Amino acid sequence: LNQSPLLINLDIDPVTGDSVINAAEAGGTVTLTGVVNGDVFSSGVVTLVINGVTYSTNVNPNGTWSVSVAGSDLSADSDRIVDASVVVTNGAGQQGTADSTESFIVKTSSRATIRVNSITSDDVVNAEESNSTITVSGRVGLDASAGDTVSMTINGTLYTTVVLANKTWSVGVSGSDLAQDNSFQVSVTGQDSAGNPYAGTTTSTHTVDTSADAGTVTVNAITSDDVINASEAAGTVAVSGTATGGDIAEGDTVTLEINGETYTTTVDANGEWSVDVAGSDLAADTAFDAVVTSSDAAGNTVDTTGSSTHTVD
Ligand SMILES: [Ca+2]
Ligand SMILES: [Ca+2]
Ligand SMILES: [Ca+2]
Ligand SMILES: [Ca+2]
Ligand SMILES: [Ca+2]
Ligand SMILES: [Ca+2]
Ligand SMILES: [Ca+2]
Ligand SMILES: [Ca+2]
Ligand SMILES: [Ca+2]
Ligand SMILES: [Ca+2]
């Protein structure tokens, strides 16, 4: 009572107040604090062990204490537990000891992912798309969050948007930038609940195809001698030719304008075409073009022209 051991209790306050050690805290010094309660005493020594490293301090007259420790020791501490002990002394030279522990959480980074969808439906920017607004869209994952910033620089132009509630994102980009920059980085940046910044990135690539390729179109003789007689002019004449090369394909439309009249047919599997024409039209119009309309897989279109002349008797 004057000769008895002192009975005390040792408490450690939550580490950095929120019980969480983040990257910035880990990279500096941290103040741990607590109280010694119980019997009255006139001084004391608190010993803390963290990551095998001992820290020590005094206890204040009001029973509190506080000590600077390496964030790196807290971050490295294998079980995320601070071990603590105290010895105190009173005026009569009685002493007392106690122990305590304090667990904490270490969260020094987070992971964020991002993906980017295809650039238009086929991941190809065609001629028409290159003169339009094209949607660039994607989603973010892992620790990335609604409200995060999504950015990309495309042909030197910075485009920005924000992650939506469902973690998708999209932003309108000019076709002409996409026509000129077929590979770029997209990033998502933000901050986790412990305050650590994070960044995720991905590379979007696409191809640019803004033209289809003309082939070769020919027109055969207009009848066997390339001359329209009175008799042939009275009837129907089969006008024929070829259409091959470039993007010309079976099924392509062949268009002929003769004497103000429009005639059409399609290219066949041999690369030939034939169409029935009124003789009266060929009689009035001694020269005309055959025009084949083609397209490539990107959806660009192109006209291939063959020109014809004949005589009339
Ligand atoms: Ca903290
Ligand atoms: Ca420990
Ligand atoms: Ca792509
Ligand atoms: Ca496309
Ligand atoms: Ca680029
Ligand atoms: Ca956040
Ligand atoms: Ca093409
Ligand atoms: Ca003839
Ligand atoms: Ca003509
Ligand atoms: Ca001819």
From TrEMBL:
Transmembrane segments: none annotated. One of its GO terms (molecular function) is metal ion binding. It comes from the Bacteria. Ca(2+) 1 binds at residues 16, 18, 20, 25. This is Antifreeze protein. Ca(2+) 6 binds at residues 223, 225, 227, 232. The keyword Calcium applies. It comes from Marinomonas primoryensis. Mg(2+) 2 binds at residues 181, 183. Ca(2+) 3 binds at residues 120, 122, 124, 129.
